[PDB]
Design an enzyme around this catalytic site. Sequence first.
Site, PDB file in Angstrom:
ATOM      1  N   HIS A  46      31.853 115.912   7.510  1.00 28.31           N
ATOM      2  CA  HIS A  46      32.391 116.196   6.186  1.00 28.31           C
ATOM      3  C   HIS A  46      32.086 115.072   5.206  1.00 28.31           C
ATOM      4  CE1 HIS A  46      35.696 113.357   6.885  1.00 28.31           C
ATOM      5  NE2 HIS A  46      35.803 113.892   8.088  1.00 28.31           N
TER       6      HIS A  46
ATOM      7  N   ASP B 134      33.724 117.200  14.502  1.00 28.61           N
ATOM      8  CA  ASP B 134      33.389 116.756  13.143  1.00 28.61           C
ATOM      9  C   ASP B 134      32.779 115.355  13.131  1.00 28.61           C
ATOM     10  OD1 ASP B 134      34.198 119.174  12.148  1.00 28.61           O
ATOM     11  OD2 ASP B 134      36.127 118.459  11.383  1.00 28.61           O
TER      12      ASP B 134
ATOM     13  N   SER C 134      37.085 107.536   5.555  1.00 25.09           N
ATOM     14  CA  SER C 134      37.171 108.660   6.478  1.00 25.09           C
ATOM     15  C   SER C 134      36.359 108.448   7.749  1.00 25.09           C
ATOM     16  CB  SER C 134      36.726 109.947   5.782  1.00 25.09           C
ATOM     17  OG  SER C 134      37.600 110.278   4.716  1.00 25.09           O
TER      18      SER C 134
END
Lengths: 48, 158
Positions: free
Chosen positions: B35, B57, B109
């Site tokens: 992402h 992810d 992140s």
Amino acid sequence: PHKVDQEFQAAVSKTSWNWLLALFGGASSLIVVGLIVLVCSSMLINTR
Amino acid sequence: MCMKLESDKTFPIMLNGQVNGYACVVGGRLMKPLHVEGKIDNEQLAAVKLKKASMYDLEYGDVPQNMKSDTLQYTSDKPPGFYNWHHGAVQYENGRFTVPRGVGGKGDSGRPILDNRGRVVAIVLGGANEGTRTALSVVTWNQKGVTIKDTPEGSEPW
């Protein structure tokens, strides 16, 4: 003249139905194997 | 503490104008989230071909020469709580990684959660603010040692 009329289900010989159904059943068996391993992958991603 | 410890190993990911995520060098693996979009920095660790995961992810690869410095051991040996971090200290009370309010934003992140002995334990991905104190969706390693995901409800990536 011929006393009867040809039919597609009959004019195809039994050994030729055997060969065509063998190839089609092989294709369907590999599709079934693909769905089986997809179900196994779903089981693994539920397990994690 | 951990800010110096993870330095020169936590390589940031560019959004082409700023940083939108971090990438880790764990076991020779260039671990970056999916992402987090953009281009990774350097050139030694940027020209490699990465392989998507899409279930955890992350995205992984290999380093060509940096194995001498690709030194971030992952460890699932994990007592419950009191772990250091890029920003503060994280707590693993009740089997869940927990952080105080507020800290953690865009550009953060992909950075690792280290151990008391400089060992990577977790790679943060997102979070949710609910319950008694906010919680984190994060990729870790279970007791058996296989890669596992822990995700709260409504855990959008900050």
